[PDB]
Amino acid sequence: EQWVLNPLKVKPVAHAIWDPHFGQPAVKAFTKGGVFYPVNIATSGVYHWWYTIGMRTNNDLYAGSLFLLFLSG
Amino acid sequence: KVSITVDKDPVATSFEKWAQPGHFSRTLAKGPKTTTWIWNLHADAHDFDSHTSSLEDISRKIFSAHFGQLSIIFLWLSGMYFHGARFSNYSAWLSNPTAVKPSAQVVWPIVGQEVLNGDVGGGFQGVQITSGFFQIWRASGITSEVELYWCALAGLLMSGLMIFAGWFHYHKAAPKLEWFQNAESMLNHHLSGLLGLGCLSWAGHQIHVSLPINKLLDAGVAPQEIPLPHEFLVNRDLMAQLYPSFSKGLVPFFTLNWSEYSDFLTFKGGLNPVTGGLWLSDTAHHHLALAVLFIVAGHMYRTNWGIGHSMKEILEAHKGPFTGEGHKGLYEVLITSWHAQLSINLAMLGSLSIIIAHHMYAMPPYPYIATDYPTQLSLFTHHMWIGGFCVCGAAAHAGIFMVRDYNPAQNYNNLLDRVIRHRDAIISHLNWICIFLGFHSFGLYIHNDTMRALGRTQDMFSDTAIQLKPVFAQWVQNIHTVAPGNTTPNALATASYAFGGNVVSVGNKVAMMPISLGTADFMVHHIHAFTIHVTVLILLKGVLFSRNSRLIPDKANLGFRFPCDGPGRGGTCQSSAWDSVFLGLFWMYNCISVVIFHFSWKMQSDVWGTVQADNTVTHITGGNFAQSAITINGWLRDFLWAQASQVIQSYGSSLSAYGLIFLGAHFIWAFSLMFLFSGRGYWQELIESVVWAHNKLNFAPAIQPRALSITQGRAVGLAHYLLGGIGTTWAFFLARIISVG
Amino acid sequence: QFVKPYNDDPFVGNLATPVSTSSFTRSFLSNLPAYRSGLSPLLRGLEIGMTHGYFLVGPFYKLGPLRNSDVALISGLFSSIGLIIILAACLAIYGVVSFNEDDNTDSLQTSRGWKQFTSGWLVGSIGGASFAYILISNIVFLQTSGL
Amino acid sequence: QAALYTHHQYIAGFLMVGAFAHGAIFFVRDYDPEQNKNNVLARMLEHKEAIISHLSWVSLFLGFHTLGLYIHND
Amino acid sequence: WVTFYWHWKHVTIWQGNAGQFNESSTYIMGWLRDYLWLNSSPLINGYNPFGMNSLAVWAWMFLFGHLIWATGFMFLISWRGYWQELIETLAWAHERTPLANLVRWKDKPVALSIVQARLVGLIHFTVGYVFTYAAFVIASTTGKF
Amino acid sequence: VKRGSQVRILRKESYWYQDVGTVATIDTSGIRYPVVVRFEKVSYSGVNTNNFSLDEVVEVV
Amino acid sequence: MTAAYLPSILVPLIGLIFPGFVMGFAFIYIEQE
Amino acid sequence: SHAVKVYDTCIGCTQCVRACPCDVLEMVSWDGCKAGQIASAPRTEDCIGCKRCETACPTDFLSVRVYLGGETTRSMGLAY
Amino acid sequence: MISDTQIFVALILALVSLVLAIRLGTALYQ
Ligand code: CLA
Ligand code: CLA
Ligand code: CLA
Numbered sequence A: 001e002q003w004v005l006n007p008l009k010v011k012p013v014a015h016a017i018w019d020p021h022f023g024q025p026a027v028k029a030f031t032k033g034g035v036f037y038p039v040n041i042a043t044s045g046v047y048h049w050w051y052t053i054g055m056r057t058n059n060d061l062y063a064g065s066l067f068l069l070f071l072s073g
Numbered sequence B: 001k002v003s004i005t006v007d008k009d010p011v012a013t014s015f016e017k018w019a020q021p022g023h024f025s026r027t028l029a030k031g032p033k034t035t036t037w038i039w040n041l042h043a044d045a046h047d048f049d050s051h052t053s054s055l056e057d058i059s060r061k062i063f064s065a066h067f068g069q070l071s072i073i074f075l076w077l078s079g080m081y082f083h084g085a086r087f088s089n090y091s092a093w094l095s096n097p098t099a100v101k102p103s104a105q106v107v108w109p110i111v112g113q114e115v116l117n118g119d120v121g122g123g124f125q126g127v128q129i130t131s132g133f134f135q136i137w138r139a140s141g142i143t144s145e146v147e148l149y150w151c152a153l154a155g156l157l158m159s160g161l162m163i164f165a166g167w168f169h170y171h172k173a174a175p176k177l178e179w180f181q182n183a184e185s186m187l188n189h190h191l192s193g194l195l196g197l198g199c200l201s202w203a204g205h206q207i208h209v210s211l212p213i214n215k216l217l218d219a220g221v222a223p224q225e226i227p228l229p230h231e232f233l234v235n236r237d238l239m240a241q242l243y244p245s246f247s248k249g250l251v252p253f254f255t256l257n258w259s260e261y262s263d264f265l266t267f268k269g270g271l272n273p274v275t276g277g278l279w280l281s282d283t284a285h286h287h288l289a290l291a292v293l294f295i296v297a298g299h300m301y302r303t304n305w306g307i308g309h310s311m312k313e314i315l316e317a318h319k320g321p322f323t324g325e326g327h328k329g330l331y332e333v334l335i336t337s338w339h340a341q342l343s344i345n346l347a348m349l350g351s352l353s354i355i356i357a358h359h360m361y362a363m364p365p366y367p368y369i370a371t372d373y374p375t376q377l378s379l380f381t382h383h384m385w386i387g388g389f390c391v392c393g394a395a396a397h398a399g400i401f402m403v404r405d406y407n408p409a410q411n412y413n414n415l416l417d418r419v420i421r422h423r424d425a426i427i428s429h430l431n432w433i434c435i436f437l438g439f440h441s442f443g444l445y446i447h448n449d450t451m452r453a454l455g456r457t458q459d460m461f462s463d464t465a466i467q468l469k470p471v472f473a474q475w476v477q478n479i480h481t482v483a484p485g486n487t488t489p490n491a492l493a494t495a496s497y498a499f500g501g502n503v504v505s506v507g508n509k510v511a512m513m514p515i516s517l518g519t520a521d522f523m524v525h526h527i528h529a530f531t532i533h534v535t536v537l538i539l540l541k542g543v544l545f546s547r548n549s550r551l552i553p554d555k556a557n558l559g560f561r562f563p564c565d566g567p568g569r570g571g572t573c574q575s576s577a578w579d580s581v582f583l584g585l586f587w588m589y590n591c592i593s594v595v596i597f598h599f600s601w602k603m604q605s606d607v608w609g610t611v612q613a614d615n616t617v618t619h620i621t622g623g624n625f626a627q628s629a630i631t632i633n634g635w636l637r638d639f640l641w642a643q644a645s646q647v648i649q650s651y652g653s654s655l656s657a658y659g660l661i662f663l664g665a666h667f668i669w670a671f672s673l674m675f676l677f678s679g680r681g682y683w684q685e686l687i688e689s690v691v692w693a694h695n696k697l698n699f700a701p702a703i704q705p706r707a708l709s710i711t712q713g714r715a716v717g718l719a720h721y722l723l724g725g726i727g728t729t730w731a732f733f734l735a736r737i738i739s740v741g
Numbered sequence C: 001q002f003v004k005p006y007n008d009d010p011f012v013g014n015l016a017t018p019v020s021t022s023s024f025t026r027s028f029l030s031n032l033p034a035y036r037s038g039l040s041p042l043l044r045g046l047e048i049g050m051t052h053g054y055f056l057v058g059p060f061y062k063l064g065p066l067r068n069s070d071v072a073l074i075s076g077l078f079s080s081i082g083l084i085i086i087l088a089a090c091l092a093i094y095g096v097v098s099f100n101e102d103d104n105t106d107s108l109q110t111s112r113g114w115k116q117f118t119s120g121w122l123v124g125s126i127g128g129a130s131f132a133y134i135l136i137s138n139i140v141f142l143q144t145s146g147l
Numbered sequence D: 001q002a003a004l005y006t007h008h009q010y011i012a013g014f015l016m017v018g019a020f021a022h023g024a025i026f027f028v029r030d031y032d033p034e035q036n037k038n039n040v041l042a043r044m045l046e047h048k049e050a051i052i053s054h055l056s057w058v059s060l061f062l063g064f065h066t067l068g069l070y071i072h073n074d
Numbered sequence E: 001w002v003t004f005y006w007h008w009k010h011v012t013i014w015q016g017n018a019g020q021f022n023e024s025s026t027y028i029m030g031w032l033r034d035y036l037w038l039n040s041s042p043l044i045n046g047y048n049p050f051g052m053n054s055l056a057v058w059a060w061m062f063l064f065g066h067l068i069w070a071t072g073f074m075f076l077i078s079w080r081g082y083w084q085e086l087i088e089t090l091a092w093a094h095e096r097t098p099l100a101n102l103v104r105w106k107d108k109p110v111a112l113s114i115v116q117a118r119l120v121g122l123i124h125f126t127v128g129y130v131f132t133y134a135a136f137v138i139a140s141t142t143g144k145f
Numbered sequence F: 001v002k003r004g005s006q007v008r009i010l011r012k013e014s015y016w017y018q019d020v021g022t023v024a025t026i027d028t029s030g031i032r033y034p035v036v037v038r039f040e041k042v043s044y045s046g047v048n049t050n051n052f053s054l055d056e057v058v059e060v061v
Numbered sequence G: 001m002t003a004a005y006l007p008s009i010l011v012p013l014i015g016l017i018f019p020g021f022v023m024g025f026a027f028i029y030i031e032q033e
Numbered sequence H: 001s002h003a004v005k006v007y008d009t010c011i012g013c014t015q016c017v018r019a020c021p022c023d024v025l026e027m028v029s030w031d032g033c034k035a036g037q038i039a040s041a042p043r044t045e046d047c048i049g050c051k052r053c054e055t056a057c058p059t060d061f062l063s064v065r066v067y068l069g070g071e072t073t074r075s076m077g078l079a080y
Numbered sequence I: 001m002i003s004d005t006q007i008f009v010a011l012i013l014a015l016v017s018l019v020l021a022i023r024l025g026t027a028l029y030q
């Protein structure tokens, strides 16, 4: 939601990191993307892809995930 | 009775057999029906034990081959001396050894390769050499190109003598097997004559030629102004000026008043402050003492006069409750098998080469070699590689003896038999220790890498964290530092300053300073132990299971060098003692590569450097090793990536050859993997297709093309692997050190 | 003289050596819980676990991630308990897989014998880890290794 | 962009290797010469020698000369 | 080769120094120096004695790929008979070790088959290849831009 | 095909398929593969001789 | 009980419990007559 | 176990029987070859798959073939 | 922005898919 505003400046985050082996330096080093917890920055381009498709809110992505779970079932 | 007996004109010198390749072998004399014959010719060229069953013939062939090798070595030495005389800047280096880079090779200006004639110095441009020949000659007392020309002449004459001796002792007077099987006489003569008289003659040369010439050179006298060695020999007054004890004569020697010679025979230790090398007056005493020791040792064995020992009696007498018969039969094994002797001698020669590398860097023996960093690194790594190869060859020839010349009838309940009978315990225990060392030596590096990458730098195995201090090595270093005056009372300085002491600096450059051991040193030493133990595991397992195993009860029948025993039993690939040598050679490459990398980084980071007017020394890398050598990332970045800059930025310079060889060695190393990862069937089928293409044009060789044998493919892969890896390290080391030194 | 065939059988894959067949070796092995005579498979496991958890507590306590913390000893004990549970699971799966349900009368090579052994090992291991935890928490020498 | 390009090129190479591997498996298992009496497939098998030899020649051609030019420049 | 070409050309264009590629792509030393050596700096500095950053994970995976690649070399160069004669001794040791012969394998421990070893070495080689280049590409691109 | 005659091999599994050899002997006893053919080219196994049937060999001109 | 606790609740499960149980059950299955 | 088979190209040289480290191949009577003998594989359960029989075979492609099949203790040559 | 109720609905759908996956795995194993 904060990437669709300034996509050329915001780094897209893939998912959060929860590793009980990280030290405080590692947590601080990985806390980026404007979030407040260690994260991975996506390199798959799914952000750009979905933005182009027409996804704007997190609710759109959540609805898509629900539909794909239903389709897998 | 030890006596001389020869056969006169056993073989007629004729070219008839030069035109009959494979004559030495019954299977090969027939002719090349396939291309495998070409490779077999070379593979079996020097396997005299497979040409004939005559131990006399094999021994004569070996003797003449040794003469040929000595002639080749003398030609090599004469070439080096002649190049020093004619294509070198040796005189300029003598005038100013700390400013002009030694060089004795010049390239021709053909395709722009004249760039390799770099500005070494002394108005001379050529290829910088890292063999230490200039320092050897300076220590010897050579001060002219005329003397080097005479040295080259002597080398050429000795090469001619050696080749003539080989021909004479094969074709004119070939000694018999009774002559060859004189171990007592052959050891007495070697020990006393060869070694003892060699070091005695060298002590005489050092006392009469090297010592005064080097004394004046260190005093600063010009090489042209220094008198000549024969002048020193005949003018006892001139030598009595430099070493005032020559006015006394040899009366002190013959009266045991040896203290009179303390001026030129002294137990001083340390390094010469001017040259940075060992005291030649210490080396003269060293060699004199060695001559006495060897001449005494060479009087131990019985030859013709009753006095002496018999090695058979000694061996048979040495046995205990855990070893049954003990050393019984070993004398016969060693005087009937050349391969056992070759294995022992190769193992000892390789270990000696390694020891020589270590001792020649911590106690630079030649003048101005310590501050010639390219020479030190090159010699250390070169001798390490020779040692590793010799050890692997010792394993190979132990396996060859086990397959060929081992007889259970003559080896019953002796040490060899008992080793074979409990080989399983040895290999299992060595396997466990190898796994334990691998874990607790490399998993430490992996742990450090993971902690540094997680930011838990306080959980690492470092001097600033959990510590692994080599307390035992530090204790030994302290002992050696304090020994002068305490446990070696009549020695003025420590044997090596590496143990501890003051920095020795020549030309505002460190020659040798204390080497401090910490956590990184502990880790790298235990990794050395791991690699050595794994190499030993491979080689010893192959040697012990050469004859038989639970998998292949009849392996000696297959031989020492066979591809496999088929895809049965699950697959019996690489089961022979040859394939053990193959894998152990891979692992020797690993071991020596780690050792030489350790040497390079440690010496560039904590020993070598330039000393400022403050008395402080700034090293080439500046303490990188202590905090970077504890992680594989540290080795990748601060050693390989950091130090490869010199070799990768060598284009357009006199090290452009090093850059090109870097790339070519990479190419060959990769090219080896084609042979190592592949098999013969694919290539034989590809050759079938290519032969169809050739036949479609109504032509094809009468010698049918065949893919390399399985063993030959493995050998080619290993040879290219070793050449590529060692050449990469060669270019990297030489470029880096010649750029920063 | 000192090395001979095993059990006077020259063709068995073993040798009679001082380490393998000495009087001290035989006495020690025969007196260890795994071999002592009379012990039920449960008592063997009890003794072995008592012995093993005790030394397990130490490495975790003095080299674990929370070793420089106030909770180092409790963390070490809880990691010891976790490893003990994992090893008890290993023992249980090994017992169910290797030994079939035939009854050889609790010889430690039976389903019932191995079940008793693993139960005793778990109990003894947890008990020994707890005992080591108590001793370390109450004795300064053990917390400082003599410093 | 670099990640996506590398990803899809590696996937492409894997898929091509798999396609050829399964062609070979078909030849081993499912090929019926009597059914494929002198059709394109049987002709491929007929002049496999020519195909393989010319492929080897073009490979050697390319390799020799590309590597030679690179080494000349070096 | 394909991805090296793509990545180097695009990196040079992105930084605007396409001349670097145009001039150094003609010899292999150019690739080794101005592409691999030059662009590996941020990746190998992901973590260092002086700290760490987010590229530490990619540096770790870089070394991980190197490790597994070299491990695959084991299976590809060393073949079965050696390991089968070694595992025989290991089985002997386990059977004759007291306090450990109480435990017994249910499947006879054997060395890997020939085809199995080829496959395992190939898998290790491929994983090292892919992970090493993934780390290099992503970390170098992220550290340069 | 007679003795000392050049015959081209027609056995597909043969190393000498569509190759010429010399007939060394023809056994009339009634064995499965009477003719014996000698070749100058050695096979992979190293044998330059083999036994063929009369339908797997054709005389050359 | 918020969603922020789910990572800490699950990662140990998916990474130690699920693998341990799967390995034990698979071991029992593969070694079974 | 491995499947060992013999074909009519057999000439009765017996080298396959003499080369077998186990005892899997034996000579039996035959009329299709001059020697009057043919190889047979009665004890195929003892075969290990070494293919020594295949190596010691002089006929254009082998009269004896070993097809490696299911593995047992004897086939794998496991002394433990 | 994604609520716990939304995550719980997603988890329920995931559980349904897991049950169906187990059913399919059994049917394929047969
Ligand atoms: C959708 C396409 C597809 C399909 C339907 C099949 C189907 C088949 N292939 Mg396959 N194949 C494919 C693509 C495909 N293939 C591709 C792209 C390739 C090229 C790589 C191959 C190459 C190939 C070969 C060479 C062979 C097959 C075989 C087979 C058959 C047996 C499968 C088998 O043994 O599973 C194998 C079961 C597994 C569980 C695979 C284990 C190994 C994989 C690669 C995992 C390794 C990665 C590792 C776990 C990751 C570690 C991560 C790290 C971070 C730690 C089967 C009919 C075999 C056959 O029967 O031939 C007659 C056979 O010999 N295939
Ligand atoms: C991906 C899953 C995963 C998870 C969730 C964890 C979690 C943990 N690891 Mg890590 N670890 C993993 C994978 C994982 N690891 C892998 C793959 C390896 C192999 C390289 C390691 C190797 C490793 C080491 C070498 C160490 C850790 C440690 C730790 C701990 C973090 C540091 C700390 O202060 O805790 C420590 C504080 C504690 C209070 C520990 C309490 C742990 C309880 C007792 C766990 C319960 C276990 C359970 C009952 C077992 C069920 C078995 C069943 C499945 C059969 C934590 C328990 C450190 C540690 O202390 O571990 C004990 C440690 O030293 N891990
Ligand atoms: C004192 C030293 C010594 C001696 C006298 C021998 C003697 C022998 N060895 Mg050798 N051996 C040695 C050291 C020695 N070895 C060492 C150090 C090793 C370890 C690598 C071995 C390992 C070894 C094995 C594993 C085997 C032998 C065998 C043999 C026998 C036959 C060798 C032959 O025909 O070579 C003829 C010469 C050649 C084939 C040439 C080989 C050279 C290769 C191709 C590399 C050369 C590269 C060169 C340096 C140039 C590189 C630069 C590039 C740019 C061109 C013979 C009894 C064989 C044997 O007994 O079999 C029954 C055998 O299998 N040896």
Ligand code: CLA
Pocket (backbone or CB within 6 Å): B667, B670, B671, B672, B673, B674, B675, B677, B678, B682, B686, D056, D057, D059, D060, D061, D062, D063, D064, D067
């Ligand atoms: C850098 C490593 C390397 C090199 C150079 C080659 C080279 C080759 N491979 Mg490849 N291969 C490699 C690694 C390598 N491979 C690996 C790791 C594997 C996996 C096992 C394979 C597996 C493999 C297979 C399965 C096949 C190939 C094939 C080929 C050929 C491809 C065509 C070609 O480029 O011809 C050009 C030739 C070259 C680039 C090599 C020439 C080298 C120099 C420059 C020539 C001059 C020599 C010089 C004068 C010698 C002086 C030294 C002397 C004094 C000692 C060629 C022989 C195919 C083939 O045979 O096609 C015909 C084939 O079927 N390779």
Ligand code: CLA
Pocket (backbone or CB within 6 Å): A015, A016, A017, A018, G006, G007, G008, G010, G011, G014, I007, I010, I011, I014
């Ligand atoms: C296949 C897609 C996928 C992948 C790769 C991941 C990956 C991850 N999820 Mg999961 N997740 C998924 C789908 C996926 N998720 C879906 C659809 C949901 C909504 C129900 C969730 C809900 C979810 C939560 C709430 C959390 C994670 C977390 C995580 C992380 C640790 C693993 C874990 O705790 O899983 C737990 C997963 C579940 C309890 C339910 C989802 C399980 C999926 C559907 C399994 C799919 C299997 C796949 C299709 C086939 C397997 C192939 C086989 C060869 C192994 C990790 C980054 C945890 C974390 O720490 O994140 C940072 C965390 O807190 N995920």
Ligand SMILES: CC1=CCCC(C)(C)[C@H]1/C=C/C(C)=C/C=C/C(C)=C/C=C/C=C(C)/C=C/C=C(C)/C=C/C1=C(C)CCCC1(C)C
Pocket (backbone or CB within 6 Å): C050, C051, C052, C054, C055, C123, C124, C125, C126, C127, C128, C130, C131
């Ligand atoms: C081989 C060698 C060479 C040089 C000399 C050296 C001595 C080092 C020697 C080696 C000696 C070695 C390795 C000694 C190691 C000793 C060890 C590990 C001893 C362990 C002792 C264990 C003890 C007390 C355990 C006590 C446990 C207790 C009450 C548990 C009680 C409980 C249980 C079991 C269950 C319910 C709860 C409750 C009541 C608390």
Ligand SMILES: CC1=CCCC(C)(C)[C@H]1/C=C/C(C)=C/C=C/C(C)=C/C=C/C=C(C)/C=C/C=C(C)/C=C/C1=C(C)CCCC1(C)C
Pocket (backbone or CB within 6 Å): D016, D019, D020, D022, D023, D024, D026, D027
């Ligand atoms: C359309 C257009 C636009 C711009 C101008 C341009 C001139 C380019 C013009 C024309 C473009 C054209 C003609 C493009 C041509 C592309 C073609 C022909 C691509 C084909 C690639 C072929 C491939 C991979 C083949 C792979 C074959 C495989 C695995 C075979 C495997 C097999 C084997 C080994 C045994 C038998 C079974 C089976 C499965 C067949």
Ligand SMILES: CC1=C(C/C=C(\C)CCC[C@H](C)CCC[C@H](C)CCCC(C)C)C(=O)c2ccccc2C1=O
Pocket (backbone or CB within 6 Å): B674, B675, B676, B678, B679, B680, B683, B684, B706, B707, B708, B709, B710, B712, B713, B714
């Ligand atoms: C490439 C390759 C081949 C094919 C290679 C062959 C047949 C080598 C033939 C090369 C020619 C005849 C050598 C002459 C040309 C060289 C360029 C010159 C250098 C060699 C000399 C110094 C000896 C095999 O036969 C083979 C067999 C077993 C395992 C691996 C492999 C393998 O990898």
Ligand code: SF4
Pocket (backbone or CB within 6 Å): H006, H009, H010, H011, H012, H013, H014, H015, H016, H017, H038, H039, H056, H057, H058, H059, H062, H063, H064
């Ligand atoms: S070797 Fe081939 S031909 Fe000779 S007997 Fe055995 S099978 Fe018959």
Ligand code: SF4
Pocket (backbone or CB within 6 Å): B568, H004, H019, H020, H021, H022, H023, H024, H025, H046, H047, H048, H049, H050, H051, H052, H053, H054, H066
């Ligand atoms: S394979 Fe080995 S065992 Fe089986 S038949 Fe041929 S030779 Fe006898």
